[PDB]
Amino acid sequence: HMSICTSEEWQGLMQFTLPVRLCKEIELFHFDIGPFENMWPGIFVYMVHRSCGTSCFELEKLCRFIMSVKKNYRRVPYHNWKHAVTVAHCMYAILQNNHTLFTDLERKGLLIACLCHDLDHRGFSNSYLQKFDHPLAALYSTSTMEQHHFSQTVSILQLEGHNIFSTLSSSEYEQVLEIIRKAIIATDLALYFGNRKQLEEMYQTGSLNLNNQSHRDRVIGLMMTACDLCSVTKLWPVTKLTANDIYAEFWAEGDEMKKLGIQPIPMMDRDKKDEVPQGQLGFYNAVAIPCYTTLTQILPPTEPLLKACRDNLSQWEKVIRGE
Ligand SMILES: CC(C)(CO)n1c(=O)[nH]c2c3cccnc3n(-c3ccccc3)c(=O)c21
Ligand SMILES: [Mg+2]
Ligand SMILES: [Zn+2]
Question: What whole-number distance in Å separates Cα of residue 217 and Cα of residue 182?
Fold first, then answer.
């Protein structure tokens, strides 16, 4: 079952007007949604209307969908409503800078998938649920949470007056639900490493073709990872604060493992905070930097994401050195 938004919630969203000061700021990659909480659902409406159109979705149905997605996001330290809008904004920025490379159906599907990619996240990783035999792990063997996030997306759409894709043709509706499915599954970090390695091989050899559906799905998959990790592409104080939020969620998972007598990995151990800057260095070198490097190679206008990630790596390197 899903939590439904109140009549006052979507009615207020329909009446929302985005300030002219922000419409110029929202187009840039390094944009931080953080200081505009009350404007987050309205920011998404504006983003949808600028990427797709003012009549792509019925304004009533769209406002109902957004506010109901918000209510189904848990009050965890990182994988919350704030994360969803940050991921959706990064997708908007990528789509805006490479608009014609993607179809109308893909732009609509990817912005919706981004807002729904971590729906009903309980604050626990896939390895935790699989190790401690959580009901979700029995229902989904691999990409546990990601398979659950897609199921919750379908459920929100199945609600009365929430089906934003009902006006699409049967074949297009089937296509948008498959774009969303593959995009949400791609946010499982375990799948990223193999996906980036294949794309690097396809790019280097010059065999990468955007007309090829298998290559298209791989590119979209990398875009999903790049959006999911975009907190590493913000200004250093924003990046620094977001790191505290994800570690509060990692440490809480470790605290749960400790209650069962199992010692977590240093990254999930709050008694091992000193190892966080070195752990961050490893994450940028092996995960973040290669992601944005490959993304820049395939989609050159995404270059500012790699630059901002490199700037934050240099900042973590200054922490280790003592500077
Ligand atoms: C990008 C972020 C949040 C920056 O603070 N970050 C980090 O520093 N370490 C990690 C991190 C470390 C280990 C595993 N996953 C991580 N993810 C993650 C979590 C869920 C789904 C996909 C990726 C991050 O976003 C992240
Ligand atoms: Mg996720
Ligand atoms: Zn995420």
Answer: 7
